[PDB]
Design a protein around this ligand. Structure first.
Ligand code: CL
Ligand code: CL
Ligand code: CL
Ligand code: K
Ligand code: K
Ligand code: MG
Ligand code: MG
Ligand code: MG
Ligand code: MG
Ligand code: MG
Ligand code: MG
Ligand code: MG
Ligand code: MG
Ligand code: MG
Ligand code: MG
Ligand code: MG
Ligand code: MG
Ligand code: MG
Ligand code: MG
Ligand code: MG
Ligand code: MG
Ligand code: MG
Ligand code: MG
Ligand code: MG
Ligand code: MG
Ligand code: MG
Ligand code: MG
Ligand code: MG
Ligand code: MG
Ligand code: MG
Ligand code: MG
Ligand code: MG
Ligand code: MG
Ligand code: MG
Ligand code: MG
Ligand code: MG
Ligand code: MG
Ligand code: MG
Ligand code: MG
Ligand code: NA
Ligand code: NA
Ligand code: NA
Ligand code: NA
Ligand code: NA
Ligand code: NA
Ligand code: NA
Ligand code: NA
Ligand code: NA
Ligand code: NA
Ligand code: NA
Ligand code: NA
Ligand code: NA
Ligand code: NA
Ligand code: NA
Ligand code: NA
Ligand code: NA
Ligand code: SR
Ligand code: SR
Ligand code: SR
Ligand code: SR
Ligand code: SR
Ligand code: SR
Ligand code: SR
Ligand code: SR
Ligand code: SR
Ligand code: SR
Ligand code: SR
Ligand code: SR
Ligand code: SR
Ligand code: SR
Ligand code: SR
Ligand code: SR
Ligand code: SR
Ligand code: SR
Ligand code: SR
Ligand code: SR
Ligand code: SR
Ligand code: SR
Ligand code: SR
Ligand code: SR
Ligand code: SR
Ligand code: SR
Ligand code: SR
Ligand code: SR
Ligand code: SR
Ligand code: SR
Ligand code: SR
Ligand code: SR
Ligand code: SR
Ligand code: SR
Ligand code: SR
Ligand code: SR
Ligand code: SR
Ligand code: SR
Ligand code: SR
Ligand code: SR
Ligand code: SR
Ligand code: SR
Ligand code: SR
Ligand code: SR
Ligand code: SR
Ligand code: SR
Ligand code: SR
Lengths: 73, 56, 237
RNA sequence: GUGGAAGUCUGUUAGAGUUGGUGUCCUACAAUACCCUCUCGUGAUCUAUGUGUAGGGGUGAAAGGCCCAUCGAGUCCGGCA
RNA sequence: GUCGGGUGAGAACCCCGACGGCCUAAUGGAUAAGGGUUCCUCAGCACUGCUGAUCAGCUGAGGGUUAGCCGGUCCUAAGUCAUACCGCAACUCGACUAUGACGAAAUGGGAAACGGGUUAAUAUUCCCGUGCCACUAUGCAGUGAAAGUUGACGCCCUGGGGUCGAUCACGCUGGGCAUCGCCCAGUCGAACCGUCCAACUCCGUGGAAGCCGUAAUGGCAGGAAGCGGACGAACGGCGGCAUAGGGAAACGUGAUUCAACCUGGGGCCCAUGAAAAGACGAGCAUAGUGUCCGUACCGAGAACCGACACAGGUGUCCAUGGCGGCGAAAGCCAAGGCCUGUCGGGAGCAACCAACGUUAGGGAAUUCGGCAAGUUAGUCCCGUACCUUCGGAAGAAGGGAUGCCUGCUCCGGAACGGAGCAGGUCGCAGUGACUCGGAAGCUCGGACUGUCUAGUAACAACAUAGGUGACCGCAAAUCCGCAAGGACUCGUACGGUCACUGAAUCCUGCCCAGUGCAGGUAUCUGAACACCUCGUACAAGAGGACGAAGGACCUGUCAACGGCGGGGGUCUUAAGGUAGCGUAGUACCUUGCCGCAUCAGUAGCGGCUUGCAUGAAUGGAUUAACCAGAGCUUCACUGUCCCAACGUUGGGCCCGGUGAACUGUACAUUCCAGUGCGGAGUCUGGAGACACCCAGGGGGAAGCGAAGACCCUAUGGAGCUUUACUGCAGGCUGUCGCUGAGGACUCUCACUCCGGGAGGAGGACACCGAUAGCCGGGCA
RNA sequence: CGAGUGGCUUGCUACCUCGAUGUCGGUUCCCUCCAUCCUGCCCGUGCAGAAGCGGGCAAGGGUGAGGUUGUUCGCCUAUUA
RNA sequence: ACGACCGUAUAGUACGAGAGGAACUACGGUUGGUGGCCACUGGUGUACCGGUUGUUCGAGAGAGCACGUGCCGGGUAGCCA
RNA sequence: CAACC
């Protein structure tokens, strides 16, 4: 996590980098199939190592609060 | 690093060269313009009244 | 004195230009004769250097391969539609008139056929509120109610890459890399830290603007610095 | 245990730089040099060549710094005796 | 460097040999830029050369650079120019849009050449041998032909394949050494043609419900392992090439570690890592053509730039030669290069100076200050505090070990890899040289890495992430241009412009009176054109009515400029200093008072604190980590000191040769007093004084060097400032022209914008031209 | 209260020097003055002695080391004739 | 070219109720300064002898280099305090 | 105390 930052930057900065990157690297359920195999390929780009589904999402999360809204309405 | 002697060693770029039109070593090979006769800049020959005393 | 930095910018010299020769494409909506019979298939998701967001490469029926301003949730293989009769689903483009009220939209055109002007940045979206035969009311990301021609085209859904701003740059070096991909001179030296000759706030034994910062709208370039025509300042009240 | 992150550490690796000696030199080897010590050395890094920005204008992580030993407004000639 | 010798009229420095040395990322090899003949030969020494010279980068004369396959040439990059169009009084000026061209010689892309021989000097260019590419012609084959592939690509970690090199083992050839039996060199052989294929991907079979696999991640009923197959790599292996070449000879064979090169796996991005020509796709024979330009040499402590044969500066690759060790480190040594970082001879070689070695006892007493010097040091084991943002602090501290020899154990396929054990044994000392941290505490500053005054400032200054305020919905905000036009912008509020503060943490009080900005505004004030009255046969002009922005007036606003006192138990001028901190990098008084520490402490730290004159994003407080930043204390150590000595190397001194500069009104052997424009070698009185020369440290010549930079003076200059004077851009606003029809309105036809177009939006407005009022250190 | 001497402080003046006489403190090295701190020899005493206190002649010699502070000065410490 | 001090004897005496407490003179030493000298102690001593690390000369022997001694130990003359 | 305050 923010351990690569050593004693630099301060709590907050590396506290959020940790959480953000923590949720970022968790197992994500592919929208195509349903397997927890989605990994980030770059900024806002995700791909499932299982079925190879490549798609767009949040910068650090595959889905954003606003994105989940579109579906509804 | 001093602006003098030590900085003079880095100078190995060719800029002004013999001009096809006037023969002076003033044809800037990067700009492709002669600073002496104006070749590359103007069909007319580079000239100025300040190249001599006003009343001469 | 000397021209301030803001004046050097206008000359458009290299230091202030955007690395355009490195930019990918201008994500303007496709131009359809009419009918909407235009459909394409998302062939790939790419990184857009000019927006720090992802873009989708699309192959249309008539053989046209073009990058498109992608909303969140668009993936390879998915089929997209662009026309008056396109289906109402994420990633599809059609005139506001055809869009159902209460639907998040992005890359909204200002004038019908201009290709899209509003809501194009990471994770943002305009909210189509009201319909009509003369005007379509849209709520832009800034919260402003915008009256638009119902004939103005737009893409359903919100822009991809949301939350980009939630993470701090943490270090100068990270800001550095992003700035190298924009038309911006960075880092920033404060006016108060410069000599009098270089800025209205320069000079003085200690640093401080020797004047009020709220400057008039009528001030000439070179003098219009600080808080431009502020309606107020601070946090109070 | 594995893994090998880092404007991360040591480092005269290359390379970049220059805290102190207020050492040597000061008609110099040199119109900015020499020696030891010292700092950086995977990055906002260093570097070659090409290319762009021009004088009340550039360029400036801002020292009025830099724009060919020249800068609180370059150089040349002219205005000019 | 030295001893011999060679040449020569002449030899320390030109050449030969021997002995002695220097250089190892360079002092060696190949080259880019740049230079331009400096290259090679012959003949010379008047010039140039830090002395000499028979020598030379010097002088004279000759000679020397050979290409289908090495560059250029071709392609396009940032970007440039030309023409057209438009602007401009105008152009050699200027932005856009089209078109065309230009833009890469080490180091972007790219059709094809290797090995050897040869010359005084060229050489993948000539010659020998072998080979390859393109185009064209002819012949056979072929109808395929354009989809796709390639050219073509970031950073970090890593597996596999694998050559050179190096090393190990044994054989062969040659050499060296001579108490042993060791030590060194060689043992060769290309492009090209042919062939082999690991990885990746895919297919068949198979049928795992827990197995498969990795250095690691991982894989699978959406079909794992196993078995078989398709496609498919090296600058690599293998065969040819080769009774080619090369070698005096032998003319090896295996192995390990493996640069090059090939091929995979993983991770990172608020960062996404060129393009185009070309190539493949798309057979073969024979023949012909392959022109043009470059090609020498230096590439640097003498061929470049720096006036020089200048200790400076100057790109690339040789990054795998041996020992060493972690190492591209030190030190020593090869290949190769050199004795030209080019004046020599002499004195135990004095004083004095530059570098440096060793110093008894004391041990910072030295000094502004431990400045300078020193101390410590590599690796392993044990062990490690306060504090902390839980990362760190930390190599904290402190302690112990360390060689050689003999025989072994463990890990690993193994190393000429690593980790240990037992016994023996030497020295004052085993990281023996070399390499190689001194340590600890308190305080101030800035959070951190980063930036800077080329040439006296590296810091606390600038930047930074973070915090905050301001403007703007894009026909925008901000900015450049006289204009045509342009940056931002292949951008669109999660944007980007303009400013302030400066990581985290806890916080950020009161004040809108003045100034600034913004909004509003009944009434007041407020220009010009038009309009009306007077005046003029007209006109000048005087007055009136209407009245935009602006102002008056009202309100909002301080993370906007800034402010937060005196007096009494309010007053100026809005408020009257809250949390905190405090004798401060701010306190004059001041060495404030108390305490700590010292024999003694204007210092430092802690506390107190009425603060001459602290205080909250003009940010306050606080703070782990970091620092060539400022101050203080301790341990250790030491020639800093007591107090200096001896020694080493280069100078200094004498001799040969070479051979400047600074400075010079004159005179001049001065000393003590006095005098004098009051700071005299020169005047006066005395004193002293025989001439010349060598060495010395610098008392005097108010020494030399620079028409004082300080200060003042000049109706001097410049940069900067502002509510100085006067103007000028620019912005806002009214009016007139563009401009049309039917104090509020409709319309379409100019004009504007959007759209490929149809057409849509807007519309007599806006843009533009002119003028008027307001603002206007942005500028003069 | 009155009269003087010095030229160490300060003030005053603007005579000398602005085509420059380098600026505090310290240090090192040399000479000097006496209005004497010690040492030699004296006089007086509210001089028993010891020791003080005051005065005279006298410049041969001596007058040192340290803590804060750039400090001069001064404050402080242990020595000292 | 010598200045100054301490100590002992004088003397627990003179003086003084006591407490306290001298001098002349004769001696021994210290300190500061001065000139000189090296038997003694101490420093140096890149004369010299030895030990030993790395590397090179094949080993041995014997040597070079590691800055003008690689490092360490001892140290004659001379010079010194 | 080394000019300006
Ligand atoms: Cl940003
Ligand atoms: Cl070439
Ligand atoms: Cl792998
Ligand atoms: K003067
Ligand atoms: K001054
Ligand atoms: Mg676009
Ligand atoms: Mg940029
Ligand atoms: Mg800043
Ligand atoms: Mg400044
Ligand atoms: Mg200004
Ligand atoms: Mg500040
Ligand atoms: Mg460049
Ligand atoms: Mg300044
Ligand atoms: Mg040659
Ligand atoms: Mg030379
Ligand atoms: Mg000693
Ligand atoms: Mg002292
Ligand atoms: Mg030091
Ligand atoms: Mg084993
Ligand atoms: Mg302080
Ligand atoms: Mg800092
Ligand atoms: Mg400087
Ligand atoms: Mg620094
Ligand atoms: Mg900020
Ligand atoms: Mg931000
Ligand atoms: Mg911000
Ligand atoms: Mg700052
Ligand atoms: Mg205090
Ligand atoms: Mg406040
Ligand atoms: Mg400030
Ligand atoms: Mg003058
Ligand atoms: Mg001045
Ligand atoms: Mg002036
Ligand atoms: Mg247009
Ligand atoms: Mg002005
Ligand atoms: Mg005068
Ligand atoms: Mg002088
Ligand atoms: Mg007297
Ligand atoms: Mg005397
Ligand atoms: Na772990
Ligand atoms: Na330095
Ligand atoms: Na100028
Ligand atoms: Na092959
Ligand atoms: Na090695
Ligand atoms: Na010579
Ligand atoms: Na760093
Ligand atoms: Na106010
Ligand atoms: Na204040
Ligand atoms: Na630093
Ligand atoms: Na010494
Ligand atoms: Na003198
Ligand atoms: Na000036
Ligand atoms: Na007097
Ligand atoms: Na002085
Ligand atoms: Na005396
Ligand atoms: Na003192
Ligand atoms: Sr230099
Ligand atoms: Sr150059
Ligand atoms: Sr031209
Ligand atoms: Sr002319
Ligand atoms: Sr667009
Ligand atoms: Sr468009
Ligand atoms: Sr200022
Ligand atoms: Sr407030
Ligand atoms: Sr680093
Ligand atoms: Sr380092
Ligand atoms: Sr200095
Ligand atoms: Sr030194
Ligand atoms: Sr100098
Ligand atoms: Sr590394
Ligand atoms: Sr200059
Ligand atoms: Sr003139
Ligand atoms: Sr001669
Ligand atoms: Sr030659
Ligand atoms: Sr070209
Ligand atoms: Sr090339
Ligand atoms: Sr790289
Ligand atoms: Sr390998
Ligand atoms: Sr050549
Ligand atoms: Sr070379
Ligand atoms: Sr050089
Ligand atoms: Sr050799
Ligand atoms: Sr010579
Ligand atoms: Sr010795
Ligand atoms: Sr001290
Ligand atoms: Sr001291
Ligand atoms: Sr230790
Ligand atoms: Sr610099
Ligand atoms: Sr410096
Ligand atoms: Sr903060
Ligand atoms: Sr106000
Ligand atoms: Sr208070
Ligand atoms: Sr702070
Ligand atoms: Sr006389
Ligand atoms: Sr002299
Ligand atoms: Sr003078
Ligand atoms: Sr007297
Ligand atoms: Sr006396
Ligand atoms: Sr004082
Ligand atoms: Sr006695
Ligand atoms: Sr008694
Ligand atoms: Sr030696
Ligand atoms: Sr040692």
């Amino acid at each position: 996590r923010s351990g690569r930052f050593g004693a630099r930057y301060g709590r907050v900065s590396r506290r959020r980098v940790a959480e953000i990157e923590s949720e970022m690297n968790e197992d994500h359920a592919c929208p195509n199939c349903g397997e927890d195999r989605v990994d980030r390929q770059g900024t806002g780009i995700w791909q499932c190592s299982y079925c190879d589904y490549k798609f767009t999402g949040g910068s650090y999360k595959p889905e954003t609060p606003g994105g989940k809204t579109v579906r509804r309405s | 690093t001093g602006a003098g002697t030590p900085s003079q060693g880095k100078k190995n770029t060719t800029t002004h060269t013999k001009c096809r039109r006037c023969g002076e070593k003033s044809y800037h090979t990067k700009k492709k313009v002669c600073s002496s006769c104006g070749f590359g800049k103007s069909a007319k020959r580079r000239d100025y009244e300040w190249q001599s005393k006003a009343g001469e | 004195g000397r021209r301030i930095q803001g004046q050097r910018r206008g000359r458009g010299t290299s230091t202030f230009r955007a690395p355009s020769h490195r930019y990918k494409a201008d994500l303007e909506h496709r131009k359809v004769e009419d009918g909407d019979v235009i459909a394409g298939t998302v062939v790939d998701i790419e990184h857009d250097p000019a927006r720090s967001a992802p873009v989708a490469a699309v192959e249309f029926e008539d053989g046209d391969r073009r990058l498109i301003l992608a909303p969140e949730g668009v993936g390879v293989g998915d089929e997209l539609q662009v026309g008056v009769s396109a289906e109402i689903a994420p990633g599809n483009t059609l005139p506001l008139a055809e869009i159902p009220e209460g639907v998040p939209v992005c890359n909204v055109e200002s004038s019908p056929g201009d290709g899209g002007k509003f809501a194009r940045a990471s994770g943002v979206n305009a909210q189509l509120l009201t319909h009509d035969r003369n005007v379509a009311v849209v709520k832009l990301p800034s919260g402003e109610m915008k009256r638009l021609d119902p004939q103005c085209r737009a893409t359903i859904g919100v822009v991809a890459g949301g939350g980009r701003t939630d993470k701090p740059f943490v270090k100068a070096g990270n800001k550095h890399h992003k700035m190298k991909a924009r038309g911006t001179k960075w880092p920033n030296v404060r006016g108060v830290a410069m000599n009098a000759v270089d800025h209205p706030f320069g000079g003085g034994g200690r640093q401080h603007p020797g004047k009020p910062k709220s400057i008039s709208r009528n001030a000439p370039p070179g003098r219009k610095v600080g808080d431009i025509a502020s309606k107020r300042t601070g946090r109070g009240g």
